[PDB]
Design a protein around this ligand. Structure first.
Ligand code: FAD
Ligand code: FAD
Ligand code: FAD
Ligand code: CL
Ligand code: CL
Ligand code: CL
Lengths: 539, 540, 539
């Protein structure tokens, strides 16, 4: 008699699922792209990462963001950052699963980049902030392994380990390392040539750095690769957190960013007060170096946005299956079932493209593969990271009101999305790069012709899309970089669907994405298969 | 460098990584003297563990990340749960591992257990105080439950005697360890519990339906609370479990979480009972009689807890004062400071002596004379010591100065905790009214005092004069002098202990400083040195 | 049937009362000490300040503490502090009521200091943090008015206004000002001789300051009087927030204290990076100057603590009067009544001593009056500020559990008390100063004897106390500085009680405070009278 009502028609939130085994498109991609040997392991962590206890860690790390500790209680400079225990727990698992170095092990087998991409994608569905140090370390490791200055040769062993080490010590004394990246300044992020951080050559071949970095993520990194001006031009420096003699480097943490999302991750405004750096490569070869690593971090952005889209979608279909409206399961409602099917179709294409791209990276020794990666990485980052926002927003709306409340995973996802689109130059820069590749790089047109010819006749909308692109690649105006990049990206997904997806699935994908007319209805059967694949049972 | 504007110097390193036990001379001597010497090795062991920086950090985390009340889930269903920072649970594990909640109630507990347990308690208290609340309540309630558990809960006996903290959201019977809370206070009264309006109706099966509220309901996550409610037969005490036997959640509704000055790591709720099921303990109307048994022990914990926090505050102060220089010399060498610090050390010596003598009384409660001693000095010790805590800790804070007023320091948290112990369980006045009630109603109280006072007569002139004043001060029966009488009675208790077991110079010092009404007592250079030295260890 | 219980015996909290007219001892003191002309105004603001709306401003200012803005969104240094709107409202009223300068107006009448003290004591009961800038400004004003450097002569008018101006502008362009004091450094606050902030003389006569201040309250002050080392000794500098040319002075705000209490008030850790200062007086004359101001701020500490004890006590008795326990009003319960009466008696004494002490300051032109002030100011600060903690804690306990909750005014008061005892050298330094006056000052022993002889024979306990002080002054050790200062303070209050208080009241006070035998019962008539005077009706 105390109650005013009974609570019903409230679906149970998705948890204790298998992030891997419930993703049909992913299972197929992993095996298809030569990482089948990691399938058992993927399912293993898929189950671990998908538990309530795991998702809670994600929540804790974000709602208890890091504190910047500039001083101690005595008034001495401290320059440290303090995290919630959940942060460290996430790091342990990321490093245990070698998301930061799997591909760089000395005996790493074929498909390692692809396998590692799958491992990454699972973690990304749980928590995103923690991916930042992992992404940076992953991209920087190959570079360091062959360019480490003499005083830090003993970093090789920890760089190749599977142990997270949060000890406040010099890198050489630690079990595992994290590498950060300091490029962006107040005057520019895309245009790094405008940096005003200067480096004066010190004695032993080291340099004195004086300047600042505007966005300096993971200040607790064991080292940052930093860009600074020298007499010889813009160079890249290895700036360790501790000097060889055990003293703390002269990096001053001034301010912690107060971010829309990505809140679990510490992003600082730092200043260099005669900090010591070691020159990597040659003076003026700075931009050339960070361009090598950029390729890989961009891929992580695209993959990360995709992972979050996948999670948001999983939450949405799980909810829509249980929630009833107007007498029927929400997911049975014609208009909803239509929207959800198009969303699933979106993820199928992205899964296909992203893991094809991963294969390219795994086989970068092949000039044709390296060129494929060089081209589609920026494209995938631009398109997928742009889609993230509208896509996650839609998922949120499938849940309705409760999806707009912070107790749900959706707001945090929705809040994270834009960071991936802004990171590393932003969309426009991606598109200018795509244009630059088509123009400057040799044998690009030949590479495209081969793939397009390989699937000609399989689908009318694809072939028409190919014709439209070649017509736009005659007079490629800069102001059409987005149109060109988008169309180029779709053709990439299209080819993959046509080659390896079932004919009905590819027919569906091509129609929905490449049919300019619109009004595209999907067969009852193809919709059922999409939604079924998106919940597993295809593994 | 050229970037700096100054050099940081004369800033002392904060006290950490010390041994909370081995650095307390008075405590080591007390433990051995009061028959708990067998626990000395263990005490030093946890004394080291608890005194580490990592441990102190747990204390800080538990307080600056206070519990959240979860009334509802994301679906709009009632949840009635409380979510803590991991540090809270870590503190609880250690407290239970160290059996601070049940050591004395083990079936084979040896002699001195209450005294040993008091020492274990005192160490923990210096680290974090909030976590002590569930421990204090469970410790006081356990003896009662062990022999009064209703039939459906006989399988609580094993967990009640364990050393395993269990935070699982399950019925008690399925758990490895338990916590018992206490629901007495209502909006209309805390001291006067007969004004309770929570009512209980007897049901067909022997349990009762409770409808009402509790104003301060600490540790709502307890596995059960002993609750007072009105019945047709009068004010009774009920065992109100969090889960019913059939695994369903009892009808206890958590409405509001208190936003407290201190004690913040501990969840204190405003709850309402919506036909919650309770099991009658004892007889209808025997309610106040039951919670009076348990009150004796929780009061002791309040006194000990305040003492522990005073000890910690003092440790921080002397450690600071030893390093900090002012006007060319170590702060602790400055005549006026060294004088204040010595009086503070002297304060703790007396409290240590009295509190652990009291702990012995509880350990030997089978002896009528000991039980009476406890019945008399427990309330007195709670009144005086818990009152002193505030000015005492404030003084410690001032020894550090500006930095002691900042929350990065342990001092503000200690300063903020202190009043809770004085307010808890009736408050100072109630303690004093109780002391007066014992002198009046209880038989052979005057005889008991006479024996102790005679045993030390002639040893100190200020003590004997203090004894004369008390016996006279009792000349006219008067409620409005309850505090004067309770305070004087307390000092005489400490005095006797110092005179019997402390060194003659130490006891001479204590008696002069505490009992010399003519004030202005200077202390010998030697006695001050010995006080401060004892307060840092080396006497163990 | 929805309810589980009925709420009763829950007293209404004290609000919408008159902070002045409810304080019998205060009304009498104001009239007695030559400030009876302000009575109509004191009752006026006493009404305004006691309102719920007023008290709410206090709460807001403290639960929404200031934020330090070291940088703006563009990464340019900003060094500003942002307050809750309630803070500025509190400031507006304080300045409107001239709590910061009443006594320094050019045509200030007799008893201005005593009237200002009364106004201060009322504001102090609503909010304490806001008193910091007021106290500092009040103490520095007289000094500045006759020492202002040439470039800041036009500061005279604003210094004497009733205007609060929070505009971020150079002083000269504002309608009112606030002055701060920067003395304490990390190495010491009591021993300022250990300061390492150094000032070099410049071409133009001003100085370059490089150093730091550990506690630096009201960083938003229009100027700070700062102590720094020069070639000729430790000196006092006028450091304006803006330079004459409008540029911001080189005062760098590094960090904001996270305080036990006093949270509404901004206290900073600051550093000087070649900040411009102007010498006040002669080099090495620094300590001599800040000693002149120290006199008045120490008085404000004592007054503030007294004020907060008064407020606490008002709350306690209003509560005890409504709250029932064991069938009677809590205030009727013999033990409670006894305690509350002693507390009231405590405030009677303090009120008498403080406003006699205020008279001394007002008539400081008389050497005998200045000497009385010189002696009892340090004493009153030591004793009263020390009593504050146990006193307010008692008040809190009268309310019980609800008094321990932050929704009550008690915790905020309780959290405030220690700051007044720590400010300006702390208790020990006060007692050392009192000893220095009894030793180094001439005619002190005479001044005291004149007062004691004037009341000899009126009370046995008072005379016995006098004989014990004179005996304790035979051998005046340093270690007895507290015992001596305490005894002195008591005799001070005692003299005032015996002279101007009703004989029964003076007897009660003497018996309670000076009867070493303890165990004093008070008559039912004197208790009824004490509590009646503490709720007004004597005005
Ligand atoms: C959460 C977070 C963390 C970060 N962490 C780091 C870090 O760890 N290390 C680091 O170095 N940086 C970091 N950054 C900075 C980030 O890399 C840059 O912000 C990003 O590269 C864009 O630089 P910017 O902000 O200066 O944008 P701007 O350079 O001002 O660019 C503005 C816009 O102009 C567009 N644009 C640029 N050139 C052209 C052109 N020729 N034609 C048309 N449009 C153009 C860009 O697409 C962009 O959208 C972080 C940023 C965020 C939000
Ligand atoms: C952090 C915290 C946690 C708490 N947790 C719990 C809990 O878990 N369970 C629980 O039951 N209670 C709890 N309490 C309540 C606490 O036990 C009561 O607040 C306390 O007993 C005082 O009662 P009260 O607040 O009703 O004050 P009142 O009973 O209104 O008394 C107020 C004052 O009156 C004095 N007084 C009472 N009677 C007399 C008399 N005859 N003569 C003179 N003076 C008298 C009291 O000593 C006290 O100073 C908690 C309180 C706090 C602050
Ligand atoms: C909220 C707040 C605001 C503040 N604002 C300001 C401000 O605006 N400007 C400013 O300059 N300071 C400020 N302070 C600091 C305050 O003035 C100092 O902290 C105070 O003077 C004591 O200095 P300290 O902390 O260095 O104590 P210390 O100098 O380390 O003193 C330590 C203790 O030893 C005692 N002592 C010192 N010398 C002796 C001796 N010879 N014999 C016996 N005992 C002795 C002292 O009384 C003190 O209790 C502020 C502090 C607080 C908490
Ligand atoms: Cl900081
Ligand atoms: Cl809730
Ligand atoms: Cl800032």
């Amino acid at each position: 008699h105390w109650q005013t009502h009974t609570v019903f028609n409230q679906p149970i939130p998705l948890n204790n699922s298998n992030l891997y085994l419930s993703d049909g498109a992913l299972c197929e991609a992993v095996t298809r792209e030569g990482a089948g040997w990691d399938s058992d392991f993927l399912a293993s962590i898929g189950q671990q990462l998908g538990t309530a206890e795991s998702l809670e860690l994600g929540r804790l790390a974000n709602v208890n963001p890091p504190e910047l500790l500039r001083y101690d209680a005595q008034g001495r400079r401290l320059d440290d950052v303090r995290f919630h225990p959940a942060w460290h727990l996430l790091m342990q698992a990321l490093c245990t699963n070698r998301v930061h170095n799997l591909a760089w092990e000395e005996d790493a087998r074929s498909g390692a980049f692809v396998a590692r991409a799958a491992r990454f994608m699972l973690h990304a569905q749980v928590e995103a902030g923690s991916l930042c140090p992992i992404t940076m370390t992953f991209a920087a490791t190959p570079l360091l392994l062959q360019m480490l200055p003499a005083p830090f040769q003993d970093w090789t062993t920890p760089l190749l380990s599977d142990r997270y080490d949060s000890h406040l010590l010099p890198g050489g004394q630690k079990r595992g390392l994290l590498i950060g990246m300091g490029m962006t300044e107040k005057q520019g992020g895309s245009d790094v040539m405008s940096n005003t951080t200067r480096a004066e050559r010190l004695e032993d071949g080291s340099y004195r750095l004086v300047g600042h970095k505007w966005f300096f993520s993971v200040p607790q990194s064991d080292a940052h690769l930093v860009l600074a001006q020298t007499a010889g031009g813009l160079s890249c420096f290895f700036v360790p957190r501790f000097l060889p003699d055990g003293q703390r480097n002269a990096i001053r943490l001034e301010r912690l960013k107060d971010k829309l999302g990505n809140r679990s991750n510490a992003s600082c405004e730092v200043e260099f007060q005669d900090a010591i750096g070691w020159l990597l490569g040659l003076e003026g070869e700075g931009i050339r170096l960070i361009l090598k690593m950029g390729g890989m971090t961009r891929f992580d952005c695209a993959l990360g946005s995709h992972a979050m889209m996948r999670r948001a979608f999983s939450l949405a279909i799980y909810h829509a299956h249980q929630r009833h409206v107007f007498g029927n399961p929400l997911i049975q409602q014609p208009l909803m079932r239509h929207v959800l099917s198009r969303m699933a179709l979106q993820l199928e294409g992205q899964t296909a493209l992203l893991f094809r791209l991963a294969r390219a990276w795994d086989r970068r020794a092949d000039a044709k593969e390296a060129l494929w990666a060089r081209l589609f990485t920026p494209a995938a980052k631009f398109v997928i990271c742009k889609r993230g926002m509208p896509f996650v927003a839609e998922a949120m709306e499938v849940l309705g009101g409760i999806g707009y409340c912070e107790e749900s995973e959706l707001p945090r996802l929705y809040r994270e999305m834009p960071v991936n689109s802004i990171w590393e130059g932003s969309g426009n820069i991606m598109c200018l790069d795509v244009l630059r590749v088509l123009n400057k790089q040799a044998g690009v047109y030949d590479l495209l012709s081969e793939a397009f010819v390989e699937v000609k006749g399989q689908d009318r909308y694809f072939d028409r899309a190919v014709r439209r692109l070649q017509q736009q690649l005659r007079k490629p105006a800069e102001e059409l970089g987005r149109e060109i990049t988008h169309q180029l990206f779709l053709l990439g997904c299209g080819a993959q669907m046509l080659k390896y997806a079932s004919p009905p699935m590819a027919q569906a994908w091509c129609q929905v994405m490449l049919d300019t007319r619109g009004g595209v209805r999907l067969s009852e059967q193809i919709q059922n298969d999409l939604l079924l694949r998106a919940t597993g049972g295809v593994c």
